[PDB]
Write a protein that binds this ligand. Sequence first.
Ligand SMILES: COc1ccc2c(c1)CCCN2S(=O)(=O)[C@@H]1C[C@@H]2O[C@H]1C(c1ccc(O)cc1)=C2c1ccc(O)cc1
Lengths: 224, 239
Amino acid sequence: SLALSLTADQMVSALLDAEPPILYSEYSMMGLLTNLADRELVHMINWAKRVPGFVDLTSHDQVHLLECAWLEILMIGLVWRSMEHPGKLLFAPNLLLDRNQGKMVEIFDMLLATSSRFRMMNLQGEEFVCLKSIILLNSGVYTFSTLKSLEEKDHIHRVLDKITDTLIHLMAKAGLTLQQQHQRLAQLLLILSHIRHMSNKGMEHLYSMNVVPSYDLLLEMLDA
Amino acid sequence: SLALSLTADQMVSALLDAEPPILYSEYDPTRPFSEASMMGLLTNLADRELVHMINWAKRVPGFVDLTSHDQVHLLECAWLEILMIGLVWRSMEHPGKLLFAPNLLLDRNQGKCVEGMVEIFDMLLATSSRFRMMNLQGEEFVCLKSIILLNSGVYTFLTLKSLEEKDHIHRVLDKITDTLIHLMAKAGLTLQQQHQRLAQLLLILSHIRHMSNKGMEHLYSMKNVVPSYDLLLEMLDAH
Ligand SMILES: COc1ccc2c(c1)CCCN2S(=O)(=O)[C@@H]1C[C@@H]2O[C@H]1C(c1ccc(O)cc1)=C2c1ccc(O)cc1
């Protein structure tokens, strides 16, 4: 597998060069966020096709992973943009909202606590792209009966190992001791639990409040 | 604060001794089940397990350093995930089956007489397949279940006292990471393997969190089953 022969720095370079652009709101917030997320989705697809190992998977498996990950990925992008703005969520450069204005207030607070935790930890951009790759490959991997699917799962897990190794390398380069490398790895992956939880809450708050991209839509966008 | 002084070997031992008992389900169930009666057995088992889960939590190194309010907050956020990982562990040796209790072993086809539950089944069965394929060790299971207790609710805290406890929580989590790695090293794993397995284990926790969210919808919708703040409170003060 082409993904599996990459070094850490080559993996990090691939992800960095695949990063989607920071988009702008075009001006009711729900409409502004819906429009913004819809335009963000088109870039997420094309970024995902550039995650090493992702296009080795079958188209069906690619859609399943994107189905499961799409909101976690939008959310981690949001908390990364809002990192250097304590107390505010940087939805877009022209749409920077705070708690009162933001609210739906429960979701808002959890996002602010995620951003603050990333500020606390001095999360680096090279680490962020790795984390967002892990979300793409991990979130749907436990919910795919055949020998093809067994291979696909095995492939995903070996690419996930390659990203783990990449993360460890980045920390070792920054001088962290081995004890500090394992600890910080754990800290990063434990926040991914919180993101899933925020994604699930956002989903159910969407229901109580169509806008979720369908399996067929994702497959159309992936295949075109 | 004795908690952060422990070595890895004494962390394992502390958690192993803290493991709660395996309870039996209600012995006289009419079968086949209906939706109602199955829920009745499961709710009843979960309500009895919850009592023992409190006693275990108070023996997790560092848990009782927290204020009582924050102990409850952590149990509120984690209680279903902990019931689930325990269920997943019990069922490792039973492919295609969930061992709720030694006398309540259920297949996938039984889960569907509860309306929405078969999907959760499907997900809990796959976690037990995963754990079996990684040959998840008991000592690793007790570390993971402790991480859930302290992690699931930490991101929703906090002011100085709050920042102190969140830092105390993360320093215990760091100490359970150190422990997991120590286990992997003595089992002989290369460092590369030690890190890859740690990651593998911690990413499964995100799935467990999904399943809990899934399940919790159901309990609230489609609520009195969920243990209240007062109920947890007070089980905690019964010291
Ligand atoms: C085959 O019928 C099912 C199966 C799953 C579900 C339902 C029916 C109803 C809809 C919700 N789900 S569920 O996912 O939320 C939850 C996880 C597990 O099953 C449920 C359950 C439980 C049931 C009643 C409660 O009062 C408390 C918890 C579970 C449990 C109980 C004890 C354990 O020691 C470990 C896990």
